[PDB]
Design a protein around this ligand. Sequence first.
Ligand SMILES: Nc1ncnc2c1ncn2[C@@H]1O[C@H](COP(=O)(O)OP(=O)(O)O)[C@@H](O)[C@H]1O
Ligand SMILES: Nc1ncnc2c1ncn2[C@@H]1O[C@H](COP(=O)(O)OP(=O)(O)O)[C@@H](O)[C@H]1O
Ligand SMILES: [Mg+2]
Ligand SMILES: [Mg+2]
Ligand SMILES: [Mg+2]
Lengths: 350, 346
Amino acid sequence: LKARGGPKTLRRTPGVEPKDIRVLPGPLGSGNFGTVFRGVFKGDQDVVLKNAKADVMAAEELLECEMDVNYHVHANAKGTCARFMGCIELGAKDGGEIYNGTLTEGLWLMWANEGENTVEALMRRGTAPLATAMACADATELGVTKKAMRELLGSLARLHECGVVHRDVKPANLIAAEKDGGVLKLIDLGAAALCLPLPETLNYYPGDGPADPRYAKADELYLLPPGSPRPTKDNAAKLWEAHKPDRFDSWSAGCVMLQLAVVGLRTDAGLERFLADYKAVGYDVNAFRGEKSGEYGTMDFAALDANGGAGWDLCQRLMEAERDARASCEAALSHAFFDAAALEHHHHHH
Amino acid sequence: LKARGGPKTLRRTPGVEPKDIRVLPGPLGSGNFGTVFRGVFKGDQDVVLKNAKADVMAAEELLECEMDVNYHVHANAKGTCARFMGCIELGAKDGGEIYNGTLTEGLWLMWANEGENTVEALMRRGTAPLATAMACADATELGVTKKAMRELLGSLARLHECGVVHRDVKPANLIAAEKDGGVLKLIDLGAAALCLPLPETLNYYPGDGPADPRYAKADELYLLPPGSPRPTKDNAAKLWEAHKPDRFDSWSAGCVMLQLAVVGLRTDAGLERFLADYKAVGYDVNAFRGEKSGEYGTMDFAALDANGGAGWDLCQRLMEAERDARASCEAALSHAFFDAAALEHH
Ligand SMILES: Nc1ncnc2c1ncn2[C@@H]1O[C@H](COP(=O)(O)OP(=O)(O)O)[C@@H](O)[C@H]1O
Ligand SMILES: Nc1ncnc2c1ncn2[C@@H]1O[C@H](COP(=O)(O)OP(=O)(O)O)[C@@H](O)[C@H]1O
Ligand SMILES: [Mg+2]
Ligand SMILES: [Mg+2]
Ligand SMILES: [Mg+2]
């Protein structure tokens, strides 16, 4: 006798058919376990498409987790991240060729194209183009830092509230969404963890990595430190309070703040130099100011200096050496840095 | 009192200076731990350049190990891999911009550009363009499989002899070098281990490590099993014999052979299907042929069937479930599959 075989099963999102997706050749970035392409959906919708790298161990599992977290965020934290449009799974015979503009065999994720420029690209062109893209009236380092950080910290607080730690916060993963007033949206949940049993934790484990070493604290490349009881439904809440994995994002947000606030820190080399001196003085912002800032004559810390050094203090809060001392993104939101000035806008007010 | 500054120490290769190198925009790799670009050295030498990804944990350390292994291979197994032209290290102030043709900050490795096409790209275009690139006179599946596997196994044997296990053998990491008769050369020693103390082992440790899930044996993603002692200069030889880490490459070479020999196995899904069935029948090639091959009506296994199933037998040896049963690349090289034709009547 012979084995009967049977049909293939393919994952799909209602209203999203592969025939309606044209993929544009040319990856949008090196990528972690996946590759991102521009596409056009139904002839006139600009989208971004991601599949797994064939050469990376368990990339399909990582893409599945990214998919799961994206569904979670879509349901619980709308507007924090790029709009998630679902998945499309293609088989072998129906799989196409990127050069022919068709989706290849395997699982794909799709999002709205939120804009052609990241905060990293904009900030490096200058504060002016960054402010314009952000629709930020105060086109100064202080102005863009206030507006961007309010948006970023607000979104991170909302993500943390539904149990999601992004784990890859940085200017490169922020887009000023021109179709939503220039508001910042996060992209790339490929490293994100769901840290509460809602209903099951995802991508949540003890140990280092993944982490962008530019934006993760050098001796804190983990969400959970190794050894600690692996995350289960039982201990999830306890681990959250004890190990504070969300504070991983706090540190990264502090890095975002430094780069927004200080032009000279917008290069990898600039931020690296600062963080090295910061560490050297015991992660003490005032000690940096007292001992080191004098060696930064090519830079301008005015945005951090302003209003009694409010920005410096917010940086200190977000970038405390110890997680037990480090501000949550939610707490960081109520900081004086975000206060309206006395009588602000008085000259035009009704 | 203020702490004094001092010089920055940079690594350099004699004969290779920053002003000698122009980088061309457009990355070539899948971009895991490093980024690869084409470049031009001294105005008219085509080269390839690799730097560490700034956004990946331990990227520079991974590149440093790839550098060390490249020097070892350059010294001990010339011709097995792309020609290694050394390194160039640059500082931040002293770094440029890729889109402006200049090397950016950090360590860079440089190799000769060995050719524009990998075996993965060629085989997927077809046996004909693959054979042409290989200067392979017998432009059939059997012909390209014989020539390619002789070259690949010969090179792996030479690497193994000097203690190197490549650990990323696959068609995407083979280039047909037109300038050298079309011979296949390995690229990408980024996952490689030095398994002998010369003077120390490199990237060699117990347990799972880097692997391409298509080309590494799924239940065998290690060079040394998880229970193995850490390698030392004193036990390295014992561990080599006991755990046969080179047999990791043997399995991958078997996968290469399957794709060269059978057109339908050249897609990822094709080879994945075969390996699933192969595992299901106990890693037994004859059981595959008897129980499973009838399900593969769209494929042609003639190259493996030929000459008493010589190809199938060589695959079986390269792909035994147990390392202790699996052929070394050196032993495989002497297989009947590579025998000269008798009585050719010239
Ligand atoms: N929803 C989106 N809208 C617009 N651009 C996007 C979106 N998602 C991702 N991108 C762009 O795709 C690129 C993907 O790069 P990525 O996969 O992050 O690799 P890397 O981290 O090496 O840059 C990024 O430059 C990003 O700006
Ligand atoms: N010496 C070389 N000559 C020609 N092309 C090369 C050479 N080395 C690498 N390449 C090309 O660059 C790509 C990436 O190089 P590789 O070392 O395989 O890094 P990775 O696979 O990690 O991206 C290869 O797939 C190949 O196309
Ligand atoms: Mg990314
Ligand atoms: Mg695949
Ligand atoms: Mg490679």
